[PDB]
Design a binder for this molecule. Structure first.
Ligand SMILES: Nc1ncnc2c1ncn2[C@@H]1O[C@H](COP(=O)(O)OP(=O)(O)OP(=O)(O)O)[C@@H](O)[C@H]1O
Ligand SMILES: Nc1ncnc2c1ncn2[C@@H]1O[C@H](COP(=O)(O)OP(=O)(O)OP(=O)(O)O)[C@@H](O)[C@H]1O
Ligand SMILES: Nc1ncnc2c1ncn2[C@@H]1O[C@H](COP(=O)(O)OP(=O)(O)O)[C@@H](O)[C@H]1O
Ligand SMILES: [Mg+2]
Ligand SMILES: [Mg+2]
Lengths: 137, 117, 467, 476, 90, 464, 137
């Protein structure tokens, strides 16, 4: 987020035309070009890898702001952290329902994939049921 | 009805009507609780929860995420299953029996896994 | 030649043409004269941009009313500089270093440029040492850091300045070092009140006051913080003094920067702010810091426009702080003073490795109860508490008592209520809130917990109420 | 003389070529007696904001200097007059004999040129004088939705200064300046009528920028009024200035800024809208004795939308002034007039400027009302408390145009804070109060004189007051 | 998403208000002849549901005011972005 | 000395004049479109002086077919409308052209539509009440002489009949005249109004000025000022009371916004023109009472998104003296005029203005009607039986009071043969005081439908 | 709506000043000029007529958007269709509570005018009472 702000400052000072929230047109391109250099190389290129952990700060849990939307659409999943979950004792304050990894079981060892294959869906359904059955007698 | 036939259209419209009513009732259920609904609305809510769960499906492309292999449901079986659901023929099965399955045989197997039938 | 001339005047921004080879450097102080009778003065301009063709754009420190095109402008050759030393203590200065309580005082002092680089990264050392205040809410939930950066956020009239006065009372009075207060874009009569109050408390002799207040051009409101910080940096780097730096209000520095950016012809950023908002805040804030062996405890009031905590100015301020006390209009409406939002406020040293396991556990329990209470407000607003489970009703009563007991009769609140303030030792605060979270005071009425000190005060008030 | 030429004109902005010696913020004469202020001076032209009838400005017209930075005439001759933001009479009563001229952008007294506010400014409104007292040199915001009685509060405050005026003592007198920004012409006329009927026009000046004015006049009016007041304040006089209302001035300034193509921010307002209001209200001050001890008390009015005091302009002004009186539409529509709200209304610096007797009577009263509001929204003691709160709410109701002297307010608040109203029915609390007050003025007026002279309620005078209350109640 | 959330809350509050008003009228009828009875456990249902209906009305009013503030603010911000782009291209 | 078109951008026309012949701001210029199919005379209004002898103007008609370089003639004045008694009974556009009789009124005296309000000293410093003779208006929502009355209500609530009623009453009771200003007027509805007023035989008492919806924003902006200029002539020169109807004032504000956008001005909050308040003030401050004569205005007001805090209604309501809401519910009960007595309001229903007795009686009526509205839901769902006896007494009394707010209107004579009534204010006050006290609860409900004062009440009670 | 979008596109590409929603200052004129040509001619002109049925697509049922507001102001009446009604099976999904025809009964034959007289009030009362469906006894 701070890099996007710095790039916006530069673009506005160069008097390049602004867009949403006064950001330059190519702010999404800035982040996408940055984050697509994180890759898992082919065995022909040595098999090396770079894993990216970008951090985005939202305001008032508004993930629909411009830069958060861009980066969410770029990356291979996200861990949404929420202050409400944090204050409730859920640390790490990961919102299971909307957090996801786009690689899935391929990023886990076999034992973990075995014991956790349906954990995220089970927890999403559990949160749904807890909300629904809050006042059921 | 002209293209897909009367039965398919009717079942789809009934599913949509039930789900729309459930959406309308969700805020009330959240605040005042389900017990303050009328009997018909309680029945509709149970049916709608089962319907919304049965619309979910274990997909072939999703096995990388769930570890569960996918399934395919014929259209005739889908229409019959949702016709039965909208009539409350499965109201006695736990809603968790309807989650991420294929057809009615998958439903029966999961229900027996959950102690129902 | 060597002397420029005014070519354009657009409010407090002046374009000055200089001869080739005599264009002043960025931030140089230039001088022009206004001769029209009532407004006669010497304008100090600060070079802000090199426009090309031997033109510079400068920000006037004084209003430009009466300035005429073509008047001669002289380049001092240096930036704005302020007097530094032990002598600035006990005296009030404006953003240019002029002493207001004694005009001409300090002209013989060493003078430091108000612009300078922040400390080198290798000299920066994180500060983790609790600065106990005696305020229950701060001590428990948002413990302040000695040598660290504290900010008090809040909307209009929620208690930022009264809390700054509180912290001057609690921290500056017994301070063994030097204090610097920077009035930035705030009420002039508040500056007068602070001057008189410090004189009465005998804290003035240890305090340097620098004021650029509301009725100033945006350039002065942008630079006064730098001037006060320059005095604070002298104390930190030249004398080894522990320094207390109070700023009220830093949002006004950001707002003045926005006004100036608009006057400079820059393209606006979101919400009309300057594109360099984060850069300017970064320069200023990075100068406001402790270094290895050299302590500055800084406390800043931060206005929140239209109670909008998402506004870019406070939003960029958040990153620069070790402790953040967020004042809430909702809390204020309840009569709770200090009007702290206990869930939104934070402190970097509120972790078990620093404050100990018991303090941390009690704080986390208080926060969990308050968060649960907040989550239930949707139901309560409509139906009240009578529809909740037994556990939730118990939690709601506990949370109401806790939220009231976070209030305190402050030292600086006497002026408004006639009630002397109270100081609660941190240990008693931990014990009291442990007992509260455990339900040991569930029988006492809610009002017994309102605007009091420690457990003896609670006992006395509850007894007065019959409980 | 230097003469410039209009090179283009539009939407209240003219551009003039020439006038090399023109000053920033100087006044310029355009034909037809039109005036403009030189805002922008560049190598090519001067950008002037037209203050007056902009439609008469034409390309090619001759523009003359006045040789004066933006300024208005000032002097004692402005009392009893109605003028526009340029200081020109619009009451049709002839010329105004100006003592001098004062520039509108002179800076406020510095931190060392002031002293704490310690003298009360009696509004004559029980709710305000008792719960949000105003000292001389204070700035107290009057904020509320439309048609909530804000102008009524300010006009009653101006009317209350009549007795102080009649003393003849410049240390007691309060000269008043009422500034109408964007108000209906008929409302300004009715304000003038009310002030005339109360004998207030003797010591009041009206600066009018009605709703039909162009934005320049609306933007300028508060500074004109403030300059006229400052001329008195710096001569050791005490001034009360009412800005009715600064929301309209903010709107006018936003219009001018947008017409100058200045990029706007929150709610399309320019970034310096805060500066606009803050520099204006900073000039209301209580001066140090070295500067003569004069003061100017500011009563800016802000119109909220749907009681939204968290909006941009309301929060700006709240963060400028020393407290606010928040007038609610619910209270106003329930007949609780003035519709003051204790939960929000506060005076930050007024406690020091409040006579002893008023302090003693109103101390418990303020908190009593604040709590009783919630207790009502929600045992025998609680029911008695509710009855007391209802009686106090009736006690603080006040008719329009009827300000109470401070000693009368002391007695009136004493009636309610000492249980002397519990006997009388709630619906009579007003009439009773009024009747009782008249009684003390007809006979046993020693209490009023004692309270006025000593500024405190003695135990003996208090007991005599209770005895008079009891005798009147039996008569009642 | 702020305006969308506010509108969802307005719809929820309106439905709650309708249900509580119906329940208050039903309780009125039953008086002449569950746990939604206010402080009864801690006639009563009628008073509790009248209170809930009034609270839902107040909530709807406040939410509608917030929604209109957000609607106006979104129009203003959109225009600000459009005009800023146009000016930069001027 | 004639200018020439230099730029054409939709309704915006830039025109160049010789050095010393530049027209003043707001001057009306004339240009010709000669293409046969679209041939017309364009009226341009000078909006800005661009410098170098250029002026920017707003065309009052579509510029299709206009050619660069065609001659532009300066008329030497702003848009000017015909004035005098001759404009009554005729329809005009915003430019003064007669629509029902092209060429009519070209020889009348012509007044510029841009005029100042009365000088501050010439204003009346005290409000006055415009006694209409209608019970509901006079009692609950008294109208201010020289004030402004917002009017609300969809189609089918009797709004047109109420307008006709006010035209009737101003003509026959005050000896005044009416000006209707159709701002953004639908052509179908303008035609309907013209025919209906002719049928009602009130056309002779009223001048119609239509700025139609399908016109460029300039005419829709200026039509209100044109109608106001005619009304101002009637008030100031003929010494008559005038009733000025504006429908819709919001469309005047929106046309101002459109013009402001066309001229390149940066929009203010919520997209409105920066000078929104100044434009509204310039319009509304001309509607006042001066020198013993007044223009009273009834204005239809549209509220965007029902958001009363929206800048347009917020600016308009700064000038409104009363509000009359017409309710489909009331209309459906046969209560005419269908004024919703609870939603309607007046800023002069205060003891200081209308007196103590009037205020007390009005508040009593409001209290009774509000309690009745509260009991309505119980009545509807559980039945009137469930109500306590005191509640039944209140219901009966309130039903009689609300039926007595109905009246037989002058304009209703053309639908129901019976003529209308004019109830003096004192009679209304005493009648409703007695009704609240419960001195007519025995009389049948129908006795209160569509009558005047107490004599009519007695007559109809005996006739039943 | 599509025509207004096309006209806005043209206007912006022509660098004409934009207003709310970036529309030019004459979009209302665009639609009002179009729709006032739908008319009922007098007998002198042959008595012909043209009836206009403009269609407007709302987004999230925001009829206070710029173009819906304009066209609603222009037309003689509105048929508001709603997706919630459509999903409830109410097809055609017209919201009779907010739909209006200002021409009204003048556009109906006498028989329809009679049989349809009570429809509006009956439906309004039904909507008021729907909350009490399950308490019909
Ligand atoms: N602890 C307190 N006890 C009682 N009253 C208080 C307390 N703190 C603040 N107040 C009241 O609130 C008023 C506003 O407080 P303060 O000046 O500290 O607010 P602020 O956030 O600095 O305001 P602004 O934005 O206007 O500068 C004080 O004048 C006093 O009236
Ligand atoms: N104390 C009072 N008692 C009775 N009536 C009052 C009182 N104060 C004001 N009013 C009346 O209430 C109405 C509103 O008063 P006023 O014009 O002062 O309010 P406002 O908020 O300034 O209004 P506006 O928005 O029109 O400027 C007027 O009729 C005034 O006569
Ligand atoms: N007072 C009345 N007496 C008899 N009929 C009335 C009365 N008011 C209205 N109407 C009838 O109701 C219809 C609607 O009235 P009108 O004012 O034309 O509505 P709108 O102006 O909204 O079209 C008219 O056709 C008229 O005949
Ligand atoms: Mg402060
Ligand atoms: Mg007012």
């Amino acid at each position: 987020s701070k890099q996007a702000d710095a790039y916006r400052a530069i673009s506005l000072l160069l008097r390049r035309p602004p867009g949403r929230e006064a950001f330059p047109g190519d702010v999404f391109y800035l982040h996408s070009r940055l984050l697509e250099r994180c890759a898992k190389l082919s065995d022909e290129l040595g098999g090396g890898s770079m894993t990216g952990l970008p951090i985005i700060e939202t305001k008032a849990n508004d993930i629909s702001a411009f830069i958060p939307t861009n980066v969410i659409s770029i990356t291979d999943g996200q861990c949404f952290l929420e202050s409400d979950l944090f204050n409730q004792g859920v640390r790490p304050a990961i919102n299971v329902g909307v957090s996801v990894s786009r690689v899935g079981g391929a990023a886990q060892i076999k034992a973990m994939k075995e014991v956790a294959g349906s954990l995220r869906l089970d927890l999403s359904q559990y949160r749904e049921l807890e909300a629904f059955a809050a006042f059921a007698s | 009805p002209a293209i897909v036939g009367d039965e398919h259209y009717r079942v789809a419209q009934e599913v949509i009507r039930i789900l729309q009513r459930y959406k309308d009732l969700q805020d009330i259920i959240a605040i005042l609780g389900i017990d303050e609904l009328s009997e018909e609305d309680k029945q509709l809510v149970n049916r709608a929860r089962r319907i919304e769960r049965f619309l979910s499906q274990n997909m072939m492309a999703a096995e990388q995420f769930t570890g569960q292999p996918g399934s395919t449901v014929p259209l005739k079986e889908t229409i019959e299953a949702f016709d039965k659901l909208t009539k409350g023929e499965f109201d006695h099965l736990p809603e968790q029996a309807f989650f991420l399955i294929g057809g009615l045989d998958d439903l029966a197997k999961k229900a027996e896994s959950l102690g129902a039938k | 030649k060597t002397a420029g001339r005014v070519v354009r005047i657009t409010g407090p921004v002046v374009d000055v043409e200089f001869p080739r080879g005599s264009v002043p450097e960025l931030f140089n102080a230039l001088h022009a004269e206004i001769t029209f009778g009532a407004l006669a003065k010497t304008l100090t301009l600060e070079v802000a941009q090199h426009l090309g063709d031997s033109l510079v754009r400068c920000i006037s420190m004084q209003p430009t009313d009466g300035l005429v095109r073509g008047v001669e402008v002289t380049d001092t050759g240096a930036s704005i500089s302020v007097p530094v030393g032990d002598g600035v203590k006990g005296h009030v200065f404006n953003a240019l270093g002029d002493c207001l309580d004694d005009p001409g005082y300090g002209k013989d002092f060493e003078h430091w440029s108000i612009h300078r680089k922040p400390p080198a990264f290798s000299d920066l050392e994180p500060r983790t040492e609790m600065l106990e205040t005696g305020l229950k809410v701060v001590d428990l939930l948002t413990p302040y850091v000695r040598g660290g950066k504290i900010a008090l956020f809040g909307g209009a009239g929620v208690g930022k300045t009264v809390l700054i006065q509180e912290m001057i009372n609690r921290i500056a009075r017994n301070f063994g070092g030097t204090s610097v207060f920077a009035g930035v874009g705030e009420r002039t009569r508040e500056g007068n009140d602070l001057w008189v109050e410090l004189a009465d408390a005998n804290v003035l002799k240890d305090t340097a006051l620098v004021f650029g207040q509301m009725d100033e051009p945006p350039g002065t409101r942008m630079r006064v913080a730098l001037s006060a910080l320059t005095m604070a940096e002298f104390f930190r780097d030249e004398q080894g003094q522990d320094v207390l730096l109070f700023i009220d209000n830093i949002f006004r520095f950001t707002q003045a920067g926005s006004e100036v950016s608009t006057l400079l012809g820059r393209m606006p950023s979101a919400v009309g702010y300057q594109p360099t908002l984060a850069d300017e805040m970064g320069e200023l804030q990075e100068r406001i810091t402790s270094t290895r062996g050299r302590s500055i405890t800084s406390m800043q009031a931060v206005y929140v426009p239209a109670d909008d905590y998402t506004d870019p100015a406070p939003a960029t301020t958040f990153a620069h702080l070790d402790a953040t006390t967020e004042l809430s209009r909702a809390v204020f409406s309840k009569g709770i003073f200090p009007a702290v939002d206990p869930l939104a406020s934070s402190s970097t040293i509120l972790d078990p490795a620093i404050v100990g396991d018991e303090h941390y556990r009690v704080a986390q329990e208080v926060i969990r109860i308050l968060q649960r209470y907040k989550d239930l407000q949707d139901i309560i607003a409509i139906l009240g508490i009578d529809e909740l489970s037994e556990e939730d009703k118990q939690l709601v009563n506990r949370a109401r008592r806790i939220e009231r007991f976070l209030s305190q009769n402050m030292m600086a609140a006497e002026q408004f209520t006639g009630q002397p303030g109270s100081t609660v030792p941190l240990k008693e605060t931990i014990e009291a809130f442990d007992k509260l979270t455990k339900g040991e005071f569930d029988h006492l009425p809610e009002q017994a917990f309102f605007l009091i000190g420690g457990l003896d005060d609670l006992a006395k008030k509850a007894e007065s109420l019959g409980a | 003389e230097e003469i410039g030429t209009v090179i283009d004109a539009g939407d209240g902005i003219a551009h003039v070529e020439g006038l090399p010696s023109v000053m920033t913020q100087e006044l310029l004469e355009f034909p037809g007696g039109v005036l403009g202020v030189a805002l922008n001076l560049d190598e090519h032209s001067v950008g002037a904001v037209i203050l007056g009838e902009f439609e008469k400005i034409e390309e090619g017209q001759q523009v003359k200097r006045t040789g004066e930075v933006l300024s208005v005439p000032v002097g004692d001759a402005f009392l009893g007059r109605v003028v526009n933001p340029l200081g020109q009479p619009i009451d049709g009563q002839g010329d105004i004999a100006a003592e001098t001229r004062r520039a509108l952008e002179l800076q406020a007294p510095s931190v060392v040129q002031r002293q704490s506010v310690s003298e009360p400014l009696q509004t004559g409104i029980k709710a305000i004088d008792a719960m949000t007292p105003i000292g001389r040199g204070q700035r107290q915001l009057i904020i509320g939705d439309r048609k909530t009685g804000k102008t009524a509060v300010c006009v009653d405050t101006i009317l209350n200064q009549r007795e102080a005026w009649l003393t003849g003592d410049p240390k007691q007198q309060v000269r008043c300046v009422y500034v109408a920004i964007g108000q209906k012409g008929t409302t300004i006329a009715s304000v003038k009528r009310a002030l005339e009927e109360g004998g207030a026009m003797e010591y009041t000046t009206i600066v009018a920028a009605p709703a039909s004015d162009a934005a320049g006049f609306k933007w300028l009016a508060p500074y004109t009024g403030s300059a006229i007041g400052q001329h008195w304040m710096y001569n050791g006089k005490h001034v009360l200035i009412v800005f009715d209302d600064l929301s309209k001035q903010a709107d006018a300034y936003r219009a001018i800024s947008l017409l100058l193509r200045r990029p706007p921010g929150r709610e399309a307002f320019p970034g310096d809208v805060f500066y606009l209001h803050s520099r204006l209200l900073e000039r209301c001050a209580k001066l140090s004795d070295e500067l003569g001890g004069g003061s100017m008390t500011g009563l800016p009015i802000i119109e909220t939308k749907a009681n939204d005091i968290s909006a941009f302009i309301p929060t700006n002004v709240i963060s400028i002034t020393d407290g606010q009186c928040f007038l609610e539409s619910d209270l106003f529509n329930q007949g609780v007039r003035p519709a003051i709200n204790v939960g929000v209304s506060v005076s930050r610096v007024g406690g020091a400027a409040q006579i002893k007797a008023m302090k003693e009577v109103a101390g418990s009263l303020r908190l009593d009302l604040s709590q009783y509001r919630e207790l009502e929204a929600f045992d025998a003691a609680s029911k008695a408390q509710l009855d007391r709160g209802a009686r106090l709410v009736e006690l603080l109701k006040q008719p329009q145009y009827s300000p109470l002297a401070v000693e009368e307010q002391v007695v009136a608040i004493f009636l309610g804070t000492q249980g002397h109203l519990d006997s009388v029915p709630v619906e009579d609390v007003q009439r009773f109060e009024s009747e009782l007050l008249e009684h003390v003025k007809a006979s046993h007026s020693d209490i009023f004189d004692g309270i006025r002279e000593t500024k405190k309620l003695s135990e003996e005078a208090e007991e005599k007051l209770v005895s008079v209350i009891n005798e009147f109640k039996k008569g009642f | 998403a702020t305006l969308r959330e506010l509108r969802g809350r307005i719809r929820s509050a309106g439905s709650i208000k309708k249900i509580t008003k119906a329940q208050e009228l039903i309780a009125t009828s039953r008086i002449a002849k569950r746990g939604l009875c206010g402080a009864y456990n801690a006639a009563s249902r009628r008073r509790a549901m009248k209170s809930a209906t009034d609270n839902a009305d107040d909530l709807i009013k406040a939410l509608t005011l917030a929604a209109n503030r957000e609607r106006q603010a979104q129009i203003t911000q959109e225009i600000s972005e459009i005009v800023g782009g146009a000016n930069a291209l001027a």
